[PDB]
Scaffold this motif. Structure first.
Motif, short mmCIF file in Angstrom:
data_model
loop_
_atom_site.label_atom_id
_atom_site.label_comp_id
_atom_site.label_asym_id
_atom_site.label_seq_id
_atom_site.Cartn_x
_atom_site.Cartn_y
_atom_site.Cartn_z
N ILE A 92 0.86 -1.17 0.00
CA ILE A 92 0.00 0.00 0.00
C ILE A 92 0.91 1.24 0.00
CG2 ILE A 92 -1.72 1.30 1.19
CD1 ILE A 92 -2.59 -1.47 2.49
N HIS A 93 0.72 2.16 -0.95
CA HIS A 93 1.63 3.28 -1.10
C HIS A 93 1.03 4.57 -1.70
CE1 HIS A 93 1.75 1.19 -4.98
NE2 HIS A 93 1.91 2.41 -5.47
N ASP A 94 1.76 5.67 -1.49
CA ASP A 94 1.45 6.98 -2.06
C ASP A 94 2.32 7.25 -3.27
OD1 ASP A 94 3.91 7.41 -0.88
OD2 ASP A 94 3.39 9.22 0.14
N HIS A 95 2.21 8.48 -3.79
CA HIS A 95 2.92 8.89 -5.01
C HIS A 95 3.52 10.30 -4.96
CE1 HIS A 95 0.16 5.62 -5.99
NE2 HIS A 95 1.10 5.25 -6.85
N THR A 96 3.83 10.77 -3.75
CA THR A 96 4.76 11.86 -3.55
C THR A 96 4.37 13.12 -4.31
OG1 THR A 96 6.37 10.11 -3.32
CG2 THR A 96 7.25 12.30 -3.43
N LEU B 210 -4.43 6.29 -1.45
CA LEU B 210 -3.33 5.36 -1.55
C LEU B 210 -3.78 4.14 -2.33
CD1 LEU B 210 -2.38 5.43 2.17
CD2 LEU B 210 -1.30 6.72 0.29
N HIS B 211 -2.86 3.36 -2.88
CA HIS B 211 -3.32 2.10 -3.42
C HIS B 211 -2.32 0.97 -3.27
CE1 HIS B 211 -1.66 2.77 -7.79
NE2 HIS B 211 -0.70 2.73 -6.86
N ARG B 212 -2.84 -0.24 -3.47
CA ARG B 212 -2.03 -1.43 -3.65
C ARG B 212 -2.35 -1.96 -5.04
NH1 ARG B 212 0.43 -5.13 -0.13
NH2 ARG B 212 -0.83 -4.64 1.72
FE FE Z 1 1.37 3.11 -7.26
#
Ligand code: FE
Length: 186
Positions: A81-85, A135-137
């Protein structure tokens, strides 16, 4: 004036025009990315897999305002699971299918991160995310088929956060490249 990209090369030229200015028309970018019909021969050079995890393969460095890369996902491979700054992120499927699970930004409280939604991204579809969305996975849930995706990031960024689904706790990650311009980059 948006035209269909005839080839991956054509797509790249068009992206340089679209990012010729200081701002991004997201709907226009997503439209042109989608309009490109995946041709495995055109991107085979970039489609370098790893047995254990998905790989990130740089295709074009852009014009200072964006990057373009190809990600290769073995059976069962997925992301954090992450962001994109604070960047625009576009994802187009070139082969196979990916499951995208959306999560909300966690509150300061330690809490299970609960899926806001999921969708199956199928060949040639272009999805979009930015931090304002969430956020996504992203995962290749297939037991039998690898997946390949094309990603555009603007501006480029080399760091992001991974989030622990159990707690919402984030850790800063530096993202690597498996290859650049078809050349493996240990
Ligand atoms: Fe991504």
């Amino acid at each position: 004036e948006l035209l269909k990209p005839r080839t991956l090369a054509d797509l790249i030229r068009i992206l340089h025009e679209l990012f010729a200015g200081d701002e991004v028309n997201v709907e226009e970018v997503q439209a042109v990315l989608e309009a490109y019909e995946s041709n495995p021969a055109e991107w085979a050079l970039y489609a370098k897999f790893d047995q254990y995890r998905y790989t990130r393969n740089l295709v074009d460095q852009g014009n200072g305002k964006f990057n373009l890369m190809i990600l290769c996902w073995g059976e069962g491979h997925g992301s954090s699971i992450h962001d994109h700054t604070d960047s625009h992120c576009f994802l187009k499927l070139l082969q196979g299918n990916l499951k995208e699970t959306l999560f909300d930004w966690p509150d300061k409280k330690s809490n299970e991160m609960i899926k806001k939604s999921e969708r199956t991204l199928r060949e040639n579809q272009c999805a979009y995310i930015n931090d304002s969305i969430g956020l996504h996975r992203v995962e290749n849930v297939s037991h039998t088929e690898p997946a390949v995706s094309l990603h555009l990031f603007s501006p480029p960024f080399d760091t992001c956060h991974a989030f622990d689904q159990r707690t919402g706790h984030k850790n800063k990650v530096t993202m690597t490249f498996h290859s650049k311009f078809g050349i493996r980059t240990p």
